[PDB]
Design a protein around this ligand. Structure first.
Ligand SMILES: O=C(O)c1ccnc2cc([C@@H](OCCN3CCCCC3)c3ccccc3Cl)[nH]c12
Ligand SMILES: [Mn+2]
Length: 309
């Protein structure tokens, strides 16, 4: 009955020499990592970038996420107004997030096992008897309050010991983003995610089947699921069979806004799925056309960007 965790995706711990160039390292791990869709990369222990966002002015209105909204399609009074609108700071969002999780599980937030949050998340997504609603500070542009990484744009002070991170190839602002094309001759910044427990992102691939790289600056883990690109059509077939019929005729760009699916459903239909808990200071790389989804274990802060090889 309970959720069965998928097998773990690969985790790499590159040496300082291997960590010098990200594209070179990603190219070398590709024979394994492209067979799992996602992989996790732990930087050397001494690689600890500062957090460079404008914290005092960081303000946002997160999106409301009803975990069982797809199951609820199977109408409620005054639907469309089920939640009051609240703006947060980083501090007040974290206070709300910690209070939600500790109240939900009746224990301190860091004492909740990651396996329990995972099992509860997937139970709540399919539950009609229990309507859990959370909030996600998603798709916050790094242009609003700055990137989480230090950047030498003369908009924020950079200490001397922080300059190496402003210049690092693993700084998401220094990843290559310009795709080659003939139109580029005739004629892209990172996004931020402030998570709370159960906030989530559903199955999707990137525009132009791009790679993506994801960094968890701080907080509780982000739980990932990934499908290798050689099974992309298998996943899409399972979606065609079991996703809500009302959304069946929708293009992929719109379908991937809403369509959540339990990883066990994909696995029972022969789709390979891998998981990982991305912890603070760790990278997750998604490979071209690798479907991925996930949810946050608690209050955290992530940064993501598509990159080109
Ligand atoms: O939250 C994470 O850590 C996370 C990790 C990896 N990939 C994604 C993708 C999303 C989101 O894409 C929303 C779409 N915007 C994307 C960038 C700005 C423009 C349009 C998303 C997709 C489905 C459901 C919810 C969410 Cl927030 N979140 C992700
Ligand atoms: Mn993505």
């Amino acid at each position: 009955a309970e959720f069965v965790p998928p097998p773990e995706c690969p985790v790499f711990e590159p040496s300082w020499e291997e960590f010098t160039d990200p594209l070179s390292f990603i190219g070398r791990i590709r024979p394994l990592a492209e067979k799992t869709g996602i992989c996790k990369i732990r930087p050397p222990k001494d690689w600890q970038p500062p957090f460079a966002c404008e914290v005092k002015s960081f303000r946002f209105t997160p999106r409301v996420q009803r975990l069982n909204e797809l199951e609820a399609m199977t109408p409620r009074e005054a639907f469309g107004f089920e939640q009051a609108v609240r703006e947060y700071t980083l501090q007040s969002f974290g206070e709300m997030a910690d209070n939600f999780k500790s109240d939900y599980f009746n224990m301190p937030v860091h004492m909740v096992p990651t396996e329990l949050v995972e099992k509860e998340f997937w139970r709540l997504v399919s539950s009609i008897e229990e309507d859990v609603i959370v909030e996600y500070g998603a798709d916050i542009s790094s242009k609003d309050f700055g990137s989480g990484f230090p950047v030498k744009d003369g908009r924020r002070k950079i200490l001397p010991e922080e300059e190496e991170y402003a210049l690092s190839g693993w700084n998401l602002n220094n990843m290559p983003v310009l795709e080659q094309s003939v139109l580029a001759h005739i004629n892209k910044v990172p996004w931020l995610y402030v998570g709370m427990c159960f906030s989530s992102f559903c199955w999707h691939i990137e525009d132009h089947w791009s790679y993506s790289i994801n960094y968890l600056h701080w907080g509780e883990p982000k739980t990932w699921y990934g499908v290798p690109s050689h099974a992309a059509e298998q996943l899409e077939e399972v979606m065609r069979e079991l996703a809500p019929e009302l959304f069946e005729s929708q293009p992929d760009l719109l379908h991937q806004l809403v369509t959540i699916m339990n990883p066990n459903v994909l696995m029972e239909h022969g789709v390979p799925v891998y998981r990982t808990n991305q912890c603070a200071g760790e990278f997750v790389v998604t490979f071209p056309r690798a479907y991925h989804s996930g949810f946050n274990q608690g209050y955290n802060f992530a940064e993501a960007v598509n990159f080109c090889t």
